[PDB]
Amino acid sequence: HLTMPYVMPGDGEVVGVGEPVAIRFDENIADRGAAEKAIKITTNPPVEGAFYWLNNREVRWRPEHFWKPGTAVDVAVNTYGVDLGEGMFGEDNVQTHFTIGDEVIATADDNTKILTVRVNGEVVKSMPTSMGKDSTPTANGIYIVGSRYKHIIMDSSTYGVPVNSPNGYRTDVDWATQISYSGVFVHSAPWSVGAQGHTNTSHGCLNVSPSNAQWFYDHVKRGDIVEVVNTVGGTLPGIDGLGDWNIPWDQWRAGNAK
Numbered sequence: 001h002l003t004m005p006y007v008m009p010g011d012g013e014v015v016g017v018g019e020p021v022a023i024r025f026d027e028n029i030a031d032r033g034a035a036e037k038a039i040k041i042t043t044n045p046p047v048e049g050a051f052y053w054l055n056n057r058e059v060r061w062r063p064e065h066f067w068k069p070g071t072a073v074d075v076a077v078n079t080y081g082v083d084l085g086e087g088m089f090g091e092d093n094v095q096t097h098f099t100i101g102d103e104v105i106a107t108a109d110d111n112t113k114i115l116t117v118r119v120n121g122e123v124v125k126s127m128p129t130s131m132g133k134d135s136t137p138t139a140n141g142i143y144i145v146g147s148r149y150k151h152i153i154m155d156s157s158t159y160g161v162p163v164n165s166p167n168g169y170r171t172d173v174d175w176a177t178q179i180s181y182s183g184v185f186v187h188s189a190p191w192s193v194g195a196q197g198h199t200n201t202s203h204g205c206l207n208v209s210p211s212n213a214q215w216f217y218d219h220v221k222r223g224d225i226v227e228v229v230n231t232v233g234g235t236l237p238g239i240d241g242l243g244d245w246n247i248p249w250d251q252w253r254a255g256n257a258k
């Protein structure tokens with residue numbers, strides 16, 4: 001009858017302008033109002049924000065617009081002993097303190113097949129890209145940068161197919177930056193450099209050259225933004241995990257505690 005809260009981002013971290021505050025409990029929360037009342041978020045410079053639940057275990061808090069660089073954020077999760085409903089009580093308190101770094105916004109336009117990275121407003125890279133093919137398109141929308149991997153094996157088991165079976169495969173991938181929980185990454189794709197800037201060839205990921213992928217890995221951080229426009233796909237769900245900014249402010253602010 002105890003549930004532990006876990007808070008992101010990490011204490012002392014510098015994050016990008018799109019990073020939400022996240023509180024994820026290890027059990028489903030029956031009384032969302034009780035949980036929200038127990039979480040106190042302070043910012044400097046002061047800016048208003050609000051809570052929205054992505055599912056029964058995890059609540060997010062963010063402002064209306066992307067954070068101002070330099071903002072310092074204190075999060076007090078004062079859940080110890082709090083009745084979170086159906087006889088579940090908060091097992092402990094948590095806190096975190098973080099700051100916002102440079103504004104880093106990369107825009108991938110399917111009309112041009114270019115991924116343009118802007119750092120504090122300056123165009124710093126114009127990367128040819130190859131996105132998802134028509135049958136497996138990359139969704140449009142605002143994506144938040146998550147984890148980064150120098151090397152990762154992307155294999156067929158992600159789509160339910162065993163690696164050693166006739167249609168199985170496993171691919172060594174370098175410089176992979178996650179931008180959705182649905183499985184979209186910006187990564188090195190040496191095999192498709194000819195297509196990048198011209199044709200979409202992937203299962204949904206943003207293929208770029210080895211040089212550009214390493215640059216992206218080295219210069220982006222958790223909470224930075226990738227925006228995809230003009231693809232034949234739909235829109236990234238607001239509840240993806242890294243899709244929070246796709247929910248309009250009035251819906252987000254109104255919340256879903258009840």
Ligand SMILES: *Sc1ccc([N+](=O)[O-])c(C(=O)O)c1
Nearest residue numbers: 154155171183185203204205
């Ligand atoms: S989204 C994504 C990235 C890389 C690879 N890969 O196999 O190199 C895939 C895939 O085809 O499974 C998907």
